[PDB]
Amino acid sequence: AAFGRATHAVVRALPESLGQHALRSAKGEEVDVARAERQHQLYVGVLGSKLGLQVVELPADESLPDCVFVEDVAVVCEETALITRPGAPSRRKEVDMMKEALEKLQLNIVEMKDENATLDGGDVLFTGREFFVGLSKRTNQRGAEILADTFKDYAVSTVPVADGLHLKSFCSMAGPNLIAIGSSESAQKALKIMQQMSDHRYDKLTVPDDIAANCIYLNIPNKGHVLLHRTPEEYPESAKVYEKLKDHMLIPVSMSELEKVDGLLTCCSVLINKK
Numbered sequence: 001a002a003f004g005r006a007t008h009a010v011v012r013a014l015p016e017s018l019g020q021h022a023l024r025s026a027k028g029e030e031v032d033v034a035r036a037e038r039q040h041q042l043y044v045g046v047l048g049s050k051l052g053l054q055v056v057e058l059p060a061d062e063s064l065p066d067c068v069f070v071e072d073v074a075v076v077c078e079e080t081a082l083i084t085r086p087g088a089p090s091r092r093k094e095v096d097m098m099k100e101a102l103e104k105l106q107l108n109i110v111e112m113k114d115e116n117a118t119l120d121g122g123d124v125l126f127t128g129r130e131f132f133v134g135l136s137k138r139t140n141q142r143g144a145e146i147l148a149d150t151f152k153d154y155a156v157s158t159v160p161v162a163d164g165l166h167l168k169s170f171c172s173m174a175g176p177n178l179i180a181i182g183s184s185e186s187a188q189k190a191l192k193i194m195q196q197m198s199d200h201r202y203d204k205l206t207v208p209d210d211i212a213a214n215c216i217y218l219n220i221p222n223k224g225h226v227l228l229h230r231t232p233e234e235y236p237e238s239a240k241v242y243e244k245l246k247d248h249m250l251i252p253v254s255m256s257e258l259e260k261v262d263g264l265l266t267c268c269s270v271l272i273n274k275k
């Protein structure tokens, strides 16, 4: 029942087409697809081999270049899975394989079907106490309302997200009651709005690189606090901050290639607690 407890993870392999065809915020560097695949394979190895989660590995689909980013297509809370309606219409065929995987794991499925609702899972921060939902270019108010209707036990509030970002482009949970947050004025502005709307006072872990505020926190039996964070080679000044979590088992995980198409650590798995 502890926050961040997980027993299962759903992931999805990336297709060769991701290199040229995945959506991306800005034209930048060439994606090395082979290197992205190696980094994705190590990421899966941490969740499954190192941490012992039961990993469901969905196969790549060359016609769905963003299909590695499974977090955008489902939000899981306890035994209920919301299958989302991704803001980019061409990603909506990703939900099919996800719905099948979650149904086989015996989760109760709720599908976002409203033709006026969109929501990317990357815009959803679940603190263990409530949800914050980014209103972005991919997630709209109607999507937020359907999420609130799906998880009626939890408060849900919204926060404006800028540009070609998701809410978790600059934050994520780093522990119980602990929000990792970027240093930018934008990231700080959104955190202030979240904190004002909440009944609770959260502790913060502030990192100097917004993108490095996306980490994966897990509570693993016989291990305790676990945190996957970006490496010192990628973001040395943010890695230094994570180093001061002395009761966390810290695991540096590279994601530099998928970051080129805006995908971060949380985006690459859906985590489930089957107690």
Ligand SMILES: *c1ccnc(NC(=O)C[C@H](N)C(=O)O)c1
Residues within 6 Å of the ligand: 022, 023, 024, 025, 066, 069, 072, 088, 122, 138, 165, 166, 168, 169, 261, 262, 263, 264, 266, 267
């Ligand atoms: C995790 C964090 C931020 N964004 C995502 N999703 C994507 O970027 C998907 C796609 N490349 C896009 O919408 O641009 C995952």
